[PDB]
Amino acid sequence: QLVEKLKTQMLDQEELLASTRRDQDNMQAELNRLQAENDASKEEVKEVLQALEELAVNYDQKSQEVEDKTKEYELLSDELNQKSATLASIDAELQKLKEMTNHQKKRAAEMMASLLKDLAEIG
Amino acid sequence: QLVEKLKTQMLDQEELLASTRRDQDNMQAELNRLQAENDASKEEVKEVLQALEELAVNYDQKSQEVEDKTKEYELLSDELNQKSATLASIDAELQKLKEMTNHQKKRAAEMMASLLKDLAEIG
Numbered sequence: 280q281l282v283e284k285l286k287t288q289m290l291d292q293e294e295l296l297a298s299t300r301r302d303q304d305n306m307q308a309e310l311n312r313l314q315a316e317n318d319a320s321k322e323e324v325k326e327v328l329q330a331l332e333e334l335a336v337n338y339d340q341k342s343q344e345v346e347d348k349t350k351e352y353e354l355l356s357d358e359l360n361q362k363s364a365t366l367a368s369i370d371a372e373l374q375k376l377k378e379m380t381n382h383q384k385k386r387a388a389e390m391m392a393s394l395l396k397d398l399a400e401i402g
Numbered sequence: 403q404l405v406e407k408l409k410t411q412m413l414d415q416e417e418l419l420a421s422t423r424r425d426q427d428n429m430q431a432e433l434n435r436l437q438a439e440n441d442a443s444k445e446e447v448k449e450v451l452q453a454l455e456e457l458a459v460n461y462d463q464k465s466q467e468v469e470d471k472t473k474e475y476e477l478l479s480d481e482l483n484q485k486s487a488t489l490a491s492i493d494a495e496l497q498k499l500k501e502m503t504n505h506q507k508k509r510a511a512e513m514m515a516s517l518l519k520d521l522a523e524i525g
Binding site for chain 1: 412415419422423426429430433436437440441443444447448450451454455457458461462464465468469471472475476478479482483485486489490492493496499500503506507510514
């Protein structure tokens with residue numbers, strides 16, 4: 280009669296120990312999930328850092344290329360501006376050539392007329 | 403009889419003047435094609451220069467962003483490395499808790515046995 284009361288007091292004290300042992304392995308269960316996420320987050324971050332240091336050299340190489348291309352065209356612009364000076368002078372060269380070919384036929388009209396005038400006097 | 407010889411001498415002298423006038427307008431024809439290409443090449447180049455100066459500010463803004471992101475992660479890496487210090491200590495915290503719950507039931511086995519021993523002596 281007294282025994283079944285005492286036996287149950289151990290049994291409650293028995294499942295109590297079973298509970299904390301279930302906890303301390305459930306608590307460690309998620310602790311090795313956190314320890315997994317943490318060491319998984321380092322591998323991600325260590326790659327992002329490795330990628331950015333690979334981007335830092337990338338954009339630096341390309342910025343040098345811009346300053347190299349801007350120098351190439353700043354030379355070209357100053358050249359084509361010097362082309363306009365040449366071409367405009369070849370225009371002035373050609374307007375003065377037209378002035379020479381018009382005087383050549385103007386002189387040709389005189390020779391025709393001054394002959395054409397002298398013939399009319401003969402008559 | 404002599405007239406048709408003289409008349410042809412002017413006619414050759416006439417088409418000769420017609421030729422150079424055709425040339426001096428054909429020569430100026432391509433000269434205003436070159437003057438077109440040249441002033442068309444300036445508008446292209448002036449845009450390339452305007453584009454590169456817009457690329458120079460572009461890559462400079464982005465390179466600053468890399469150094470800003472590398473600083474953000476260099477802070478994060480040093481934080482997650484400090485997370486491993488905490489989590490590993492919580493592991494050591496939990497192994498010492500298991501040491502406390504095992505001693506609790508080891509002490510519980512003694513009380514059962516030392517009672518179980520005293521009962522056998524009664525008999």
